[PDB]
Each structure stands twice: as C-alpha cells, then as structure tokens.
Amino acid sequence: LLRYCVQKHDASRLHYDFRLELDGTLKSWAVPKGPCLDPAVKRLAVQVEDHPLDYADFEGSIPQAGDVIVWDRGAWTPLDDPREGLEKGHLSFALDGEKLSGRWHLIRTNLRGKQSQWFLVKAKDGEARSLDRFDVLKERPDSVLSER
Numbered sequence: 001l002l003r004y005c006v007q008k009h010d011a012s013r014l015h016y017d018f019r020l021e022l023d024g025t026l027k028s029w030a031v032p033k034g035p036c037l038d039p040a041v042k043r044l045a046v047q048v049e050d051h052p053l054d055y056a057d058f059e060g061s062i063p064q065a066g067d068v069i070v071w072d073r074g075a076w077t078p079l080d081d082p083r084e085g086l087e088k089g090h091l092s093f094a095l096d097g098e099k100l101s102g103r104w105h106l107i108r109t110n111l112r113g114k115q116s117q118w119f120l121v122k123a124k125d126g127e128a129r130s131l132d133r134f135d136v137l138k139e140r141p142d143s144v145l146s147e148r
C-alpha cells in the first residue's frame with residue numbers, strides 16, 4: 001500500500017535518493033553511497049525535501065543534477081509508529097522491493113544542528129548479505145522501470 005522507491009541520481013555527486021510514502025508525500029533522504037544489505041554497514045542518508053508521489057516513477061534528466069533512474073521500487077511498512085518515529089529520529093520498517101527487502105532502520109543523529117543527518121542500516125534477517133560477498137549496487141545496477 002505505501003509506496004517506496006530508490007532513484008539512482010547521477011548528479012555532480014552520484015547518490016541514491018531513498019523515498020518512503022507517508023501522509024500523501026514521499027519522505028526522502030539522499031544516500032550518497034547507496035543502500036547496503038550488510039547490517040554492519042551504516043550508510044549516510046541526508047534528509048532532503050518531500051517529493052510528490054508521482055515522482056516515484058520519474059526517470060529522466062534534472063537540471064542543476066543529471067540523469068535519474070528508478071533503481072528500486074515497491075512498498076514499505078513501518079514496524080512502529082512512523083510519525084512518532086520520524087519526529088524522534090528512529091524509523092524501523094520493512095521493505096517489499098525488487099532489490100531491497102527485509103527489515104531496515106533509519107536513525108537520526110541527536111546532535112543540534114545536524115538534524116538532517118540520518119544513517120540507513122539493514123537489520124539482521126534473511127535478506128541481509130555480507131558486503132564482501134554481495135554488493136547489491138554492483139550486482140543489480142539497472143533501472144527497474146526501463147531496462148532494455
């Protein structure tokens with residue numbers, strides 16, 4: 001029911017935009033090194049501007065940016081009150097995507113003036129993979145909407 005997408009955004013700095021639908025908008029974080037299935041790997045995720053739901057399907061070119069593709073898409077569900085979680089700086093959730101699945105955490109720093117800084121972390125479960133054995137970004141690098 002609630003939409004999720006990850007867009008690979010080839011701007012000045014390559015990054016991945018991670019988006020979760022909540023209350024009619026896409027809550028969004030820029031994750032410069034991309035999501036990681038390894039629970040030991042914490043990935044910087046900088047909260048950015050909410051986006052409209054239909055952007056979840058957008059592929060094309062963004063002026064200053066560069067090319068955008070939809071790298072993963074699906075649904076998400078919170079495992080605890082998502083509104084309270086966003087406010088308090090911890091979202092626990094599960095993903096039902098093409099590439100990403102299983103349980104995840106977004107955790108915000110409590111440091112005053114660094115409130116935009118979160119970390120996306122894979123939770124330990126059947127979908128976790130060690131980074132030295134499987135890097136999801138390398139193994140499955142294509143658009144899920146437009147490949148070939």
Ligand SMILES: [Cl-]
Nearest residue numbers: 103123124125
């Ligand atoms: Cl557990």
Ligand SMILES: [Mn+2]
Nearest residue numbers: 009015017030
């Ligand atoms: Mn971006």
Ligand SMILES: [Y+3]
Nearest residue numbers: 083084087088
């Ligand atoms: Y509240």
Ligand SMILES: [Y+3]
Nearest residue numbers: 097098099144
């Ligand atoms: Y599939």
Ligand SMILES: [Y+3]
Nearest residue numbers: 140141142147
């Ligand atoms: Y392919």
Ligand SMILES: [Y+3]
Nearest residue numbers: 141142143147
């Ligand atoms: Y390719």
